[PDB]
């Protein structure tokens, strides 16, 4: 522990919307300092979303205006993608970094496969 809770795969309808669940149980002392969602490009995970102390940042142009990440509940950083294209099919990684009172950082990630249907 901690671990992220992310399904092995999700489906979304072509031209519709999809939610990629990424949840965790908040732990006493583990302050969330970074959230990233990444898309797998061969051997390279590529950041598409970053949440840091300055706010939310969409890091790949093709997701601009189509990407939201939950923020209202501690431990729910699920990703929502709208107007799905067939070219959105990929493996997506949820990655959360926590910092403990001593300054140590702990990182966890987990992969889901997004399939776009119909």
């Amino acid at each position, epitope marked *: *522990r901690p*671990i992220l809770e992310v399904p092995e795969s999700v489906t979304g309808p072509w031209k519709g919307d999809v939610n990629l669940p990424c949840t965790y149980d908040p732990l006493q002392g583990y302050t969330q300092v970074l959230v990233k969602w*990444l898309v*797998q490009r*061969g*051997s390279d995970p590529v950041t598409i979303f970053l949440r840091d102390s300055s706010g939310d940042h969409i890091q790949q142009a093709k997701y601009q205006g189509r990407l939201h990440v939950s923020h209202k509940v501690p431990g729910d950083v699920s990703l929502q993608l709208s107007t799905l294209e067939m070219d959105d099919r990929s493996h997506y990684t949820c990655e959360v970094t926590w910092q403990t009172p001593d300054g140590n950082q702990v990182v*966890r*990630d*987990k*992969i889901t496969e997004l399939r776009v249907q119909k």
Partner: nanobody
Amino acid sequence: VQLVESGGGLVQAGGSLRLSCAASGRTFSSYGMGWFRQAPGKEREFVAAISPFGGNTYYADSVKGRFTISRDNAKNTVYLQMNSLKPEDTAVYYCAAGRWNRYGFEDQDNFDYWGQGTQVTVSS
């Protein structure tokens, strides 16, 4: 997903063994695979891991330069070549599978599937 280990047994210090682990399913390449070990009276500890996709490899510091992990995705098989074996390497070795990518591969809670283990004994 079922995981089945092969290999193991008795070897002399300085010798070597190859362990293997076969996985069911059809999405093997997207799983990170790991090896863990447990000696009697001690807790289970990380040995090596290999990431999904590009297959980055990670090793406990005490096995770096001695053990090598690799995978054959067309065979759903992960291998552990344990060279330069020492009596301190005596333990039951377990293969495991999870959906981590670059982080958390040392944390046993990050692996959802486990084999029953194979015993390795290194005699001096």
